[PDB]
Design a protein around this ligand. Structure first.
Ligand SMILES: *[C@@H]1O[C@H](CO)[C@@H](O)[C@H](O)[C@H]1NC(C)=O
Ligand SMILES: *[C@@H]1O[C@H](CO)[C@@H](O)[C@H](O)[C@H]1NC(C)=O
Ligand SMILES: *[C@@H]1O[C@H](CO)[C@@H](O)[C@H](O)[C@H]1NC(C)=O
Ligand SMILES: *[C@@H]1O[C@H](CO)[C@@H](O)[C@H](O)[C@H]1NC(C)=O
Ligand SMILES: *[C@@H]1O[C@H](CO)[C@@H](O)[C@H](O)[C@H]1NC(C)=O
Ligand SMILES: *[C@@H]1O[C@H](CO)[C@@H](O)[C@H](O)[C@H]1NC(C)=O
Ligand SMILES: *[C@@H]1O[C@H](CO)[C@@H](O)[C@H](O)[C@H]1NC(C)=O
Ligand SMILES: *[C@@H]1O[C@H](CO)[C@@H](O)[C@H](O)[C@H]1NC(C)=O
Ligand SMILES: *[C@@H]1O[C@H](CO)[C@@H](O)[C@H](O)[C@H]1NC(C)=O
Lengths: 345, 217, 208
């Protein structure tokens, strides 16, 4: 017997203590070593209720990653309202490592193993573990990178699918590689992200087909973001410590559902020195990019969508429109922590 | 429970655009709740237009608005702005900004409201009213006909505010001309008709028009 | 997608009386329904969030109940501050609204008619006003007669908000017509119908 509860969790990792890479440095003093042999116990005839949208684990990871960033990143200048902080901005080594979140004595973590579990509701195949799987704290918008993949079918997650204010996490059951590069020696800020168009459009098709299931059967349509800061309107992320912003217009081409649609899709990307800080209020300025080839090959494992609002014409419209979203980084963590909840014994 | 603060009423020709501002927080003081914009046309049901996330400018516009609406916030993220382009007459409405209370979960439970911003879309030009008397025929009624003004509103006082006990100032009505009219009538005993002066004071600020009409038998 | 059928379209009730408006949904929506109160000239005001949760600063008589597909708002003992329109909200979808006011003893309108000023006639226009003062219910029917010839489509009327003290409405109707058209007739009348009237009342004047 147990009950739902929230407790201070601790992180564990396989960080290397001698590394200067900032995630390793952080995790070295902020986490313990991974359990060399973690146990997982399956609960024969148990059925438990999860709610990935109300999971304090997400709050803790957010606290941790914010903390990792605030002490790892070194902007030449931080601006926050009426505060201007100048400082040294040496380039850093930057590459996210897997963090596991673990419960203290007296508490256990329940894990849902239902293949098509969407994040909330009853779960039949439950088990208990001492830690989550290893989760890379990747901060990105529009696309979820280097995450884990859905087990069987593509899964749609929302706190409320019919609530247009709710972000929609799409969980892929097959990853699509995205290969971003700022070539060596054009403007040093100019980069591009290449994506196999064939694989991508097959997936993006299967996605629309899954969204169809949640909206009677209205034709699904994608569009570029209707607005917002660049971190939102572009696919935003950090690579080797540089802030990329890739234009994803070409990624959500409805026509590709015939000629030319296959083949490699190149996305125009920009490396920015002046960015908006996701951690909260303010701008940061970094030095210009390092020299040489700058390259990040990532796995697309999820997409963050926003659905277009408006039900006024009781009958109204025959199609639904979705736009790449994100910007609330807690959603990145929910993307991975969805199958876990803390219970007290 | 605090009221948000919206910009003043606006008048626009069709085809033009307007921008309504909504101050929803002090610059100087849980993801923030989005700012929602709605409008209500005269004698109509409230219509949701959009939300805007002040944290990153993320937005969602009602689809039927056809990209005509744009919402943003200032650098301090204390004020939201709604821009409506290609104005048509049926964009005439009171525009509201609304927001959920910060210690609540639903994004849609609009606890906070701006006082609303009247937006009038018309091709009529600004115009002061003419004020004609409504001469009284135990108790007699008398009033003023406030005729052909644009835009709303006009305010009506009797005897420079002095008396209000028996005053019925009716809502303005829009004439086919595109101009407004309203009446303001006053109940009074008959005896008084020959002892006390009754002046209806009419002010139409938009045309900077003041008038003092004495209503006699 | 979702459709909120609210009802009744309108209703009246005596002070201290129980009033219940209901909302129905084309689909199950759990508790994701909010209720509002909008008094004439003011912004809406949130009464009940998430179907059942009452908000701070909202009188006890106000109650929200319901779940799934059936919801309702209730006012234990109806007070005069509660005269307004009430609508439900399901995200960005709003109910049709229910106008509610105070039910009092049917009351007849005190009627008055006004010829057009001579100053207005010089303008080449003529406005004939017919005032109805302090009656209930709001319903009524003013129809203009020019020499006993009912007029229609040339009249515009305007009602006030239910007075707070006595709980009555008052109505102003304006019959508009050109100067030249006005000088063609003599008898000008307001034909009035209402519950408070045993017979349709006429109030007229002869031009000049
Ligand atoms: C997920 O599954 C549960 C099963 O109870 C269902 O109630 C819920 O609506 C689903 N969520 C979404 C948004 O698909
Ligand atoms: C992914 O999901 C879709 C259904 O959403 C399914 O048809 C497809 O076969 C799945 N792909 C893999 C590799 O499991
Ligand atoms: C990624 O793209 C770069 C630049 O085009 C190329 O040099 C590299 O081979 C690519 N890597 C992979 C894994 O395809
Ligand atoms: C792209 O993806 C398709 C589908 O998996 C694959 O056949 C092909 O080898 C990939 N590379 C190119 C150049 O299209
Ligand atoms: C709806 O869409 C699905 C998927 O395209 C299709 O198989 C089915 O015929 C349609 N019927 C309903 C109401 O699900
Ligand atoms: C991305 O590229 C498209 C096509 O060049 C352009 O129309 C659009 O404005 C761009 N989006 C952003 C966020 O700059
Ligand atoms: C979208 O579809 C068109 C039509 O087939 C295609 O030619 C074009 O390359 C695509 N554009 C984008 C935004 O990828
Ligand atoms: C994703 O993981 C790969 C392999 O570890 C890494 O090279 C790449 O930089 C990662 N992408 C991001 C955005 O962190
Ligand atoms: C939103 O989701 C909850 C469960 O998470 C459900 O009870 C409710 O019916 C949903 N609301 C709508 C509007 O469908």
């Amino acid at each position: 017997v147990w009950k739902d509860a929230d407790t201070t969790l601790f992180c564990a990792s396989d960080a290397k203590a001698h590394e200067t890479e900032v995630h390793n440095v952080w995790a070295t003093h902020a986490c313990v070593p991974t359990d060399p042999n973690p146990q997982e116990i399956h609960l024969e005839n148990v059925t438990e209720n999860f709610n990935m949208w109300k999971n304090n684990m997400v709050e803790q990871m957010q606290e941790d990653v914010i903390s990792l960033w605030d002490q790892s990143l070194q902007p030449c200048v931080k601006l926050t309202g009426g505060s201007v902080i100048k400082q040294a901005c040496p380039k850093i080594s930057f590459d996210p490592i897997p963090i596991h979140y673990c419960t203290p004595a007296g508490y256990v973590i329940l894990k849902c193993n239902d293949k098509n579990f969407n994040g909330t509701g009853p779960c039949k195949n439950v088990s208990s573990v001492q830690c989550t799987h290893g989760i890379k704290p990747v901060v990105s918008t529009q696309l979820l990178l280097n995450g884990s993949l859905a087990e069987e079918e593509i899964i749609i997650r929302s706190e409320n699918i019919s609530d247009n204010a709710k972000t929609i996490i799409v969980h892929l059951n097959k990853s699509v590689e995205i290969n971003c590069t700022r070539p060596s020696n054009g403007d040093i800020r100019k980069a591009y992200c290449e994506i196999n168009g064939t694989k991508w459009n097959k997936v993006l098709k299967q996605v629309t087909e899954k969204l169809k299931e949640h909206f009677n059967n209205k034709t699904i349509i994608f569009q570029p973001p209707s607005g917002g800061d660049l971190e939102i309107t572009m696919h935003h992320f950090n690579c080797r410590g540089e802030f990329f912003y890739c234009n994803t217009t070409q990624l959500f081409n409805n026509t590709c559902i015939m000629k030319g649609c296959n083949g490699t899709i190149t996305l125009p990307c920009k490396i920015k020195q002046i960015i908006n800080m996701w951690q909260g209020t303010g701008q940061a300025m970094y030095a210009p990019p390092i020299d040489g080839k700058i390259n990040c090959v990532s796995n697309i494992t999820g997409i963050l969508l926003t659905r277009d609002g408006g039900n006024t014409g009781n009958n109204s419209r025959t199609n639904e429109t979705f736009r790449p979203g994100g910007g609330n980084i807690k959603d990145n963590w929910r993307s991975e922590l969805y199958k876990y909840k803390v219970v007290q014994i | 429970q605090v009221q948000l603060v919206q910009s003043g009423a606006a008048v626009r020709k069709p085809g033009a655009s307007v921008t309504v501002s909504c101050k929803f927080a002090e610059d100087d003081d849980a993801p923030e709740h989005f700012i929602h914009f709605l409008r209500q046309a005269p004698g109509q049901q409230l219509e949701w237009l959009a939300w805007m996330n002040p944290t990153n400018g993320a937005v969602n516009y009602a689809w039927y608005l056809n990209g005509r609406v744009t919402a943003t916030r200032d650098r301090s993220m204390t004020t939201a702005f709604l821009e409506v382009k290609s104005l048509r007459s049926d964009d005439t409405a009171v525009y509201y900004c609304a927001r959920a209370q910060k210690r609540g979960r639903s994004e849609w439970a609009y606890a906070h409201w701006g006082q609303g911003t009247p937006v009038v879309v018309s091709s009529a030009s600004t115009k002061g009213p003419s004020v004609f008397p409504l001469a009284p025929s135990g108790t007699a009624a008398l009033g003023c006909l406030v005729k052909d003004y644009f835009p709303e509103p006009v305010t009506v006082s009797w005897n420079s505010g002095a008396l209000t006990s028996g005053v019925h100032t009716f809502p303005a009505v829009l004439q086919s001309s595109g101009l407004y009219s309203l009446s303001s009538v006053v109940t009074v005993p008959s005896s008084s008709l020959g002892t006390q002066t009754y002046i209806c004071n009419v002010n139409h600020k938009p045309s900077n028009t003041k008038v003092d009409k004495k209503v006699e038998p | 997608d979702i459709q909120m059928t609210q009802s009744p379209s309108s209703l009246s009730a005596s002070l201290g009386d129980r009033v219940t408006i209901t909302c129905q949904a084309s689909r199950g929506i759990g508790k994701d329904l909010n209720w509002y109160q909008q008094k004439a000239g003011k912004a809406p005001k949130l009464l009940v969030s998430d179907a059942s949760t009452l908000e701070g600063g909202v009188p006890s008589r106000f109650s929200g109940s319901g779940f799934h597909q059936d919801f309702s708002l209730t006012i234990s003992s109806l007070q005069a501050e509660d005269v307004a329109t009430y609508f439900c909200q399901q995200y960005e979808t709003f109910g049709q609204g229910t106008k509610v006011d105070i039910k009092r003893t049917v009351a007849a309108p005190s009627v008055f008619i006004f010829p057009p000023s001579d100053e207005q006639l010089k303008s080449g226009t003529a406005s004939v006003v017919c005032l109805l003062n302090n009656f209930y219910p709001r319903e009524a029917k003013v129809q203009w007669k020019v020499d006993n010839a009912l007029q229609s489509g040339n009249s515009q009327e305007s009602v006030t908000e239910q007075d707070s003290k006595d709980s009555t409405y008052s109505l102003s109707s304006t019959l508009t017509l050109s100067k030249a058209d006005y000088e063609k007739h003599k008898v000008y009348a307001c034909e009035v119908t209402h519950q408070g009237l045993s017979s349709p009342v006429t109030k007229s004047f002869n031009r000049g």
